[PDB]
Paper text:
Escherichia coli phage SU10 belongs to the genus Kuravirus from the class Caudoviricetes of phages with short non-contractile tails. Here we show that the virion of SU10 has a prolate head, containing genome and ejection proteins, and a tail, which is formed of portal, adaptor, nozzle, and tail needle proteins and decorated with long and short fibers. In contrast to other short-tailed phages, the tails of Kuraviruses elongate upon cell attachment. After binding to the host, SU10 tail, nozzle proteins, and short fibers re-arrange to form a nozzle that extends the tail.
Numbering used by the authors:
A (entry chain EB): 162 to 322
B (entry chain EA): 216 to 322
C (entry chain EC): 162 to 269
C-alpha cells in the first residue's frame, strides 16, 4: 500500500482519499464493490473547473449543485425556480401565471374575469362592450343591448329599459 | 455511457433528479410540469383544458361555431348556416343563404 | 509504478485510478493529452456528500444526476418532468396545460 489507509483492497478498490481533520470527513472514495462503483466525493465543495480558464462552472457547495451551463436530456425536478425559461413543448398539469403573451391559445374551457380586445371588452360584471366606427359602441349585458353613437348618445336599447 | 459530461463549461446529463433547482436561463425542448408559478410568459401555441384568468387581452377569438375578430366583430354561427354578425355599430342576422334578415344598429 | 495507481506518457498524463472490481470499471481517469483533459469518473454512483452531515445531495446514480439543490445559470434540457416550477420569465413555443390560473393573459 503506497496510499493512506485506503490503498486498494480486493473487494472494494477503495481509492479513498479520506481526509479526516477536526472530525470533518472529506474524501474521494472511489469505492468499487464490483456491483456499485461509488465515486464518493465527500466535500463541503465539489468543483469541476474547466481545464482552460479556471472557471468553476460546476460547483456543488452546501448541498447545492451550481452550474454555469448544463445540457440535461431528461430531468425530474421536485421544485424549480427559473428566472428565464425558453421551452419548445410543455405539458403543464396545473399553472398560476401573473402575465402571459400567447400567439395562438387553444383552450377547452376559459374561465375569465375580464376580457379586452383592441376594440372590445367583456367586463368581470358581464358587460360585453364592442367599439364601432366613428366611436360608436355596442354595450350589452344580461339585461340589455345598448347601441351608443360616436357622441355617447344611446341610439337603440333592447332589453330592460 | 457518459451520462454526466461536464465539457466546455456545460454539465451535460442524460438523466437528472433535482429536488430543488434555481435556474437563471432554461432552454427546454420538452417540459412536463405538475404545478407551475410563472410571473411572465410568452407562448407561441397553447392547448389549455381549463384556463382561468383574471384579465384576458385577446386579439382574435375563435370557437367551433363563433369568432370575435381583432376588429371587434363578434360572429356566431347558427343552425342551417345562419350567422349573427355583431360589432359596435350593429347586429346583423344572416340566414343559411347569406341573406341579411335583421339589422339592429347603424344601417 | 504506483500500486493504489498512475501513468505520465509524453503525450497523455493519465491520472487513471481504474478501480476495476467485478468488471465494473470504476475509475477516475483524469486524462490530459495536452489538448483535452478529461476527468472521467466511471461509477454506478458519483456521490458528492457534504463533509459535514454525510448527506449525499449530489448522487449521480444509474445514469441519473440526483441533486437535493442546484443553481444552474444556463440549462438546455431535452425533457423536463417538474413537480413544482416557479418561473419569472418564460418563452414557450408549444404548451398543453390541464389547469391554468393567469392574472393577465394577452393572446393574439
Amino acid at each position: 500500500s503506497l496510499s493512506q489507509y485506503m490503498k486498494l483492497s480486493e473487494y472494494e478498490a477503495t481509492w479513498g482519499v479520506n481526509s479526516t481533520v477536526n472530525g470533518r470527513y472529506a474524501g474521494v472514495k472511489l469505492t468499487n464493490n464490483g456491483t456499485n462503483s461509488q465515486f464518493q466525493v465527500t466535500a463541503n465543495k465539489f468543483i469541476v473547473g474547466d481545464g482552460s480558464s479556471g472557471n468553476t462552472p460546476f460547483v456543488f457547495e452546501g448541498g447545492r449543485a451550481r452550474m454555469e451551463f448544463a445540457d440535461i436530456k431528461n430531468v425530474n425536478i421536485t421544485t424549480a425556480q427559473i428566472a428565464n425559461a425558453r421551452i419548445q413543448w410543455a405539458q403543464i398539469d396545473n399553472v398560476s401565471i401573473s402575465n402571459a403573451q400567447i400567439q395562438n391559445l387553444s383552450a377547452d374551457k376559459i374561465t375569465a374575469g375580464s376580457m379586452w380586445g383592441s376594440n372590445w371588452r367583456l367586463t368581470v360584471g358581464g358587460d360585453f362592450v364592442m367599439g364601432g366606427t366613428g366611436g360608436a359602441q355596442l354595450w350589452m349585458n344580461g339585461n340589455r343591448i345598448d347601441f351608443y353613437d360616436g357622441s355617447g348618445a344611446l341610439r337603440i336599447r333592447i332589453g330592460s329599459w
